[PDB]
Amino acid sequence: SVFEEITRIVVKEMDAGGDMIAVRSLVDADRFRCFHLVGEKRTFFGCRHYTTGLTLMDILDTDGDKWLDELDSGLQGQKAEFQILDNVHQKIKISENRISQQYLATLENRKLKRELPFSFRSINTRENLYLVTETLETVKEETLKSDRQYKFWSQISQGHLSYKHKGQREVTIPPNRVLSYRVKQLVFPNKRNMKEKLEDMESVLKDLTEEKRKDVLNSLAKCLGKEDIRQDLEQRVSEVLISGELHMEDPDKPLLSSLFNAAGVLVEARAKAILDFLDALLELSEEQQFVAEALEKGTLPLLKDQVKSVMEQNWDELASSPPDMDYDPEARILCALYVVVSILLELAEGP
Amino acid sequence: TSNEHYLRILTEWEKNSSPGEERGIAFNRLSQCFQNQEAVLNLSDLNLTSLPELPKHISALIVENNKLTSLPKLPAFLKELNADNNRLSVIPELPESLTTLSVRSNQLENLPVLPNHLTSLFVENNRLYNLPALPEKLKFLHVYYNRLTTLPDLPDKLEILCAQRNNLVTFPQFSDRNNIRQKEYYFHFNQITTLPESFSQLDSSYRINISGNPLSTRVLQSLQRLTSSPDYHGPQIYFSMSD
């Protein structure tokens, strides 16, 4: 998505690679902004900021009579005007909005509250979180056309494909929008190489079924075709993992009857397996349209087999980067596609 | 008779316009902008190619994205001169009333003297090859995206200074006589190799994003020596880790 693209660009030009991180959720543009604390390193893949009903008021909600002046003191947010300009002359008009160090001090010397939401206890299990301090809003409707770029995961285009396509994707940005947000941490006042992993999963998932799998494929069509349904099925599957039960109103019911095995017993291996899928696939940012296309195609075997040669070339970097340090994102995409069709085909061919 | 001249010269400049402008709306705006002399006197998006003589009682001027031709005298103003994306000519001398000047996205190649206690400067997106002395009361600087290569001294209350993507070859003789909560000193994408010995002398209440500059390996490895060491208590300087 260009949101990812143009917000990466504004990060790089305005302040390259600092604590001001882009927004990748295209449709979820201004859900989070100044005074919207979403975020946790809650066993995520390093660079993740979950879209949850927890925002800054929902974590640190003052409940006294002095709220009326807290309206002014809280929407005091800055509207300083920046001109972002490159060879995308042209000047996109951004507003920097940074809650001042004085309010940072007041929040530090204040204390949290008692009735918090269930989402808090669901997400903050092992969360080393970050909070939005400086955010980049859009002041004027800024529908701007753009195409694409990436790096050297162009080995796909080296194999037999050519990748000569055109990303004429022109997303609309209305006024009062969001581009990027500075992240800083107030964490809580206490108030196998995946080939062998994937061999184990290949057994426990060769254990799968056909029609249940076809619902898997349709459900992943909606999920990993458009952004929104990805977080939909993400929340659903995470709830399946934690609660370990079933609500019979799930559109993903045959995969539920699949993760729960043919006898209806939840194979935790299958649950963590769809989870490692979703991790690898959401690591493939905006690959959603392409994977919905791939369901329509039935040509995942082609995709992986290409990056199968490519993965067996690239085992240098997920072993070079320790699991707790920053990986190579391109190599993560690579191993992700291995995981994609390795499993998905060992699945799609009957048990 | 004075209002009579302004009316008639405005009418001439309105009806001898080469016929491509919203200057009828600009004209009734100027009739209500001299008759009663409204504040703000906004000219934005009206595309007035040439701004004629303004009334004496002006308060704040806001004329973004209007012109290509030089401004006339701005004689006695009051607060905000906001002249974005207009022309390349020189700025008229600022009066004692002017405290905020935003000439962002303009094309002035020679910023003139900026006397008096000017507070809020925003001269981003210009071709300033030079910059004279800045006022002491300067507090929010923005020389962002400018061609200056010989950045002079800094004031003693500057907090946010954005001067990235300039031809700055040398980190200047820094005014680290400033003690702002977090120095937003964005110098990324400059031509710097030489670092003045005083990087051990600035406080940790600093982020100088010195990225993009072609530092020498020795100074870079000294920076690694102070950063990989767990006791980094100098400025929180983000160096260009191949960013």
Author numbering:
A (entry chain C): 3 to 90, 115 to 217, 247 to 406
B (entry chain B): 22 to 264
Can you provide the manuscript's text about this entry?
Gasdermins (GSDMs) are pore-forming proteins that play critical roles in host defence through pyroptosis. Recently, GSDMB was shown to exhibit direct bactericidal activity through its pore-forming activity.
To understand how GSDMB is recognized by Shigella IpaH7.8, we determined the cryogenic electron microscopy (cryo-EM) structure of human GSDMB (isoform 1, Q8TAX9-1) in complex with Shigella flexneri IpaH7.8 at an overall resolution of 3.8 Å. In the GSDMB–IpaH7.8 complex, six out of nine LRR motifs in IpaH7.8-LRR interact with GSDMB-N, resulting in a total buried surface area of about 1,826 Å2 between the two proteins, with key interaction areas divisible into two patches, I and II. Interestingly, the side chains of E15 and D17 in GSDMB insert into two small basic pockets formed by R186 and H209 together with the surrounding residues in IpaH7.8. The two pockets are approximately 10 Å apart, suggesting a potential mechanism in which IpaH7.8 recognizes a specific motif containing two acidic residues at this precise distance. In our complex structure, this fragment corresponds to the α1–β1’ loop in GSDMB in which a motif of three negatively charged residues (α1–β1’ motif) interacts extensively with IpaH7.8.
